[PDB]
Symmetry: D2
Subunit: 360 residues, 4 copies
């Protein structure tokens, strides 16, 4: 069977909305269709040919892009969980055979490649294509009927849910809370201000943190209004440098910013490294920096990807925010594009939060 | 009264053995004297004037040095735990008022200076003087009467015990062990080879790791034998660079070395930053270094001090080790100096691991 | 000054809505008045004279009842959290000196009476009175303006939240989840059909469990509709006895019912004991029952009270629930009484879930 | 092949030392013989036909007994850990495919019989036989050459190390320690005085608890000195009942004794149920009993088996105990039987703590 799809040639790079030949399967559990698809710097990165670990599935010449999906079930085997017309989010990372992979924690794989594989990124076709085939275990059912396009933010949000679990593990080193058991006054600072930063901030707000997003420039008003709505502050760190940080999260991947901010972190502080950029210039870390970290019992936790449970938590969080802030949540999506507007892979509008592809 | 002591002028530096007027405090439960005091880079740093966070007590001009102590109780009020003639190890760090301090976790003080104080380093008189006064709760009784001078290693070891608690805490983020529940074949690498590296390595072996100590040069036969006695490996990383590290503990405090090794750490790897050196040159950390740490879910934790429980577990490990390998344990204590010999704070004795001051 | 208050003579019994002496205190940060006050088996129990561990404050021959409050501020010392006009839920348990009390976990006090105290129960006037004095610290702000009278359910729900933390802690002894990381299909059974049962059920659903409430009698349509709306099931256990239980929660206090459901619990199951009935009769537990608990690595855990963080967390779940389902959440509050209707402390009003007192 | 073995008919019972025909499988990594085999209640029970959950391996009309083994490697494929001549302790319980089994925590199997199987007990041949084939990974190496026969206590001790993990996991629901961070004066009571109860007491001593073993009768003078030499107290609870218990361990399996001691447990106290007895009578558990558990936040945790890591810990503790109290440790082994002495499965030889069979 022949369909439309947005493909790349991984890692060489490039983008193309074209038609490819998809065969059928033998014994398939599920047939699905895209409805919305989100995009982040990973996609623009793949297209730029800036990612050195990505590849096409074995034997093939191309890779179908897209990992942030919101699908609908075209057909399924009988099961207690989903049926035709239900809406689902698909799992990006699939398990291998390592001690972590065999228990649904492929996000914490002990080998790396090629034990596990990410859809749209590493040797496994993504979701920007008219027809998709999968197993029910890999699908996370959207139970909230009112969510609509908002559900597509599940994929990006689950990364934050995992990272926050990693926080909960590692903050058990000491008592992070107050005298009274609470997070009140506790300070989170999120580097950057794109969708991820937003999600990170929203969740920290749920967790009781006082949250400030930050950048090396003033932001657009839509973003400013968004941060305002949810009780999130903002600071241009060239004008006003936030001090006394309890939880620091980097979505930038930039060492100068990271470590500059690392030096503002309080005793028992936790820093989460999430954002990545292979090209970022080196920043000189010295004896005093390491001493700073050590003398304060600080933890720097790199975090990547997530387990299925974290997709469930992501969806339940989007429900809570929807029914409390319907409008402004809607406005996390800052542009909706047809599949042939491939310019979105190369462009970077001021004001962007999330860009999605409404699928025909 | 007038007593003899070895003192410095914190943070400026220098040392002397001399008489000082030490007034008997207002309240106290215990009156003691030293038997042995160990020294390390901290003591030497204090004297070199290389530490800017140190300071003499209030109203006073000098600072009695010494944190690594083994004392004998001269007199003590009636209690259930210690009797006159008992030997004990004193707490370095004393609690302030924060939420970690007030539960006995001043090692994880939420404020830092000046909520917590450390005897001999920060505004609190150390243990190289004739008479010392204290509270019973701040004294850790030595139960094993065979340890003698070995008990003086309680202080340096307790920092290792806390660094291992931290490993136990942050390792719960994934499943670290093999799929048989054990740590067998899991590669622990320790940068450096001094007293702290040894203590690390011995505890690491007790925890079930394959342990390799490393340095930028080959080691003495005497130290090799000691290592070999505990089944600990040694490698010159300029002649044979270890790879696939699961637990990395640095005692150098050197950024370039720290990050060179970080780049060999496996998925789910944990890096303990322990060793500090403010004057260590700057190493440029780039976007790939950050990405490495991110894609591998690696945790970098800095660790300082310990709780009283860690002293208790330190003493017990010394007991287990001494009764298994008396000779190797004796071999750590490589010189027994008199107080008059203040030069030991300036020049490093021939083949040092642990230098100690026997107190008259 | 003279105020109105509902009061008892504890532990003796009885209740009256009367007038009382209230001297304006010296030391107070805040001045509040009740808006709504809820009641439960505890309130009836005190009034019935059935709780032998309750008592009046020192040198007073009455105890103002009421522990489940929604208050409004009248005057407050300057501070960045709460202002005149704000609504707040007061803390019930107050901390003493123990190692858990001093870190805001009076909930887990390690001493019991008289190191800790509960408003309305043990030595501390409750909240059914015209004027309350308190400290800012003991008050939790309600930030959701739509919540109104639904916030009064905070005190009951925070006990659930704590029990789930208890579950979250003890369930770490093994891997409780599916090999997909999820709780999908994990069976939760709540003994009882009361307000507490419902609260647990809703939290359990939020947690991913299949949840079933059980009583020894059939239920109403008012109640069943409410359960259905939240995806919660119901079964009369005389007609159908649930099996294969992963998390059992008892709100009844009845041995016979507890241990009968205990013997339907899976390997690694957790049982939460929450409800209390000192008057419930013995049920013979034999060695075979014990062996059953052992061989399945089952945990049986008592949970009482909660910490401030669990109030905050409670309030946040109620907004979530109210905003997803305003109907059935309104439907929890089955009667609004005036203070003079002191008959609600003797007779279960008709079809009760939660009886509140709307204050003048 | 035809070899000597001690066998039963599970579950009917019965025992004899005889000749049997054991095949060698098409796959195995190691070939071993026994050196020492321990016996406990489970063996005696098996013989009496008191355990209907026991059964012979698939296709066989008999069950080779014995699960507490010290074996020696006769031949083993090349590997980095064990060689011909080394002494090992074989794994009892072997995993299936449940989420816990597949990561080497078959001790916490989510399914039970038959995911998992125990050697000498459930569908898997035991260790009282001339020749044993196994895979390397089911073997745990004895690295202390001095331990000799004492290494046979590994199997009953590892059950103690796992129950202490359980205690560690569940005592995290609050702060269990004193406010100095220690366990000093924390009160451990162990019900019973058998081998299992000694093992619990010594580990408890290492963990910092003040420990007492109890029974409903006086104990032998030899037992008393052994206790005394480790600093463990004894008490006849019919003359002197302990109160204010922090850790309670039951090795009896008797309800009446469990629940009357539970009644002496402090706030945040932990109860471990370990001991089993299908024939112990019912004790009537009332709502006061349930109320006492709930009000004190007590946790009652059933514990069975252990992971491989716990066999390594047991081995390490035995080394530590043996090297500091050689005599007391040897006294634990109170009879060394020939395999012809099958009467030991029917009668307990006099003053028994641990009976072992010395294999020829
Ligand atoms: Zn993305
Ligand atoms: Zn894997
Ligand atoms: Zn030192
Ligand atoms: Zn502090
Ligand atoms: Zn209540
Ligand atoms: Zn308390
Ligand atoms: Zn046994
Ligand atoms: Zn299993």
């Amino acid at each position: 069977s022949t369909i439309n799809a947005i493909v790349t040639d991984a890692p060489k790079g490039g983008v193309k909305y074209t038609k490819i030949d998809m065969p059928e399967p033998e014994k398939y559990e599920a047939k699905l269709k895209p409805v919305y698809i989100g995009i982040c710097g990973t996609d623009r990165g793949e297209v730029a040919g800036a990612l050195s670990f990505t590849y096409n599935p074995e034997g093939e010449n191309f890779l179908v892009l897209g990992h942030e999906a919101l699908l609908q079930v075209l057909d399924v085997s009988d099961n207690n969980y989903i049926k035709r017309g239900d809406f689902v989010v698909p799992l990006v990372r699939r398990p291998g055979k390592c001690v972590n992979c065999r228990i649904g924690r492929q996000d914490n794989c002990s080998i790396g490649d090629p034990d596990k594989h990410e859809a749209g990124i590493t040797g496994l076709h993504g979701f920007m294509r008219d027809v998709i085939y999968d197993d029910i275990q890999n699908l996370v059912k959207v139970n909230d009927p009112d969510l609509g396009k908002i559900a597509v933010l599940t994929e990006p949000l689950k990364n934050v849910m995992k990272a926050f679990e990693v926080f909960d593990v590692v903050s058990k080193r000491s008592i992070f809370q107050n005298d009274d058991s609470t997070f009140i006054g506790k300070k989170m600072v999120v580097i950057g201000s794109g969708s991820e930063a937003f999600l990170y901030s929203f969740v920290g707000k749920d967790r009781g943190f006082d949250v400030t997003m930050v950048n090396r420039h003033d932001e657009t008003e839509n973003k400013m209004k968004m941060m305002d709505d949810f009780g999130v502050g903002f600071s241009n760190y060239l004008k006003d440098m936030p001090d006394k940080i309890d939880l620091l999260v980097d979505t930038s991947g930039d060492p100068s910013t990271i470590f500059k901010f690392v030096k503002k972190v309080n005793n028992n502080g936790v820093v989460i490294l999430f954002g990545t950029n292979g090209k970022a210039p080196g920043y000189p870390v010295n004896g005093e920096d390491i001493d700073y970290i050590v003398e304060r019992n600080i933890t720097i936790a790199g975090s990547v990807d997530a387990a299925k449970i974290h997709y469930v938590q992501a969806l339940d969080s989007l429900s809570n925010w929807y029914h409390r802030h319907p409008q402004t949540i809607k406005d996390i999506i800052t542009y909706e594009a047809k599949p042939e507007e491939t310019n979105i892979f190369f462009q970077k509008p001021k004001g962007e939060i999330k860009t999605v592809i409404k699928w025909p």
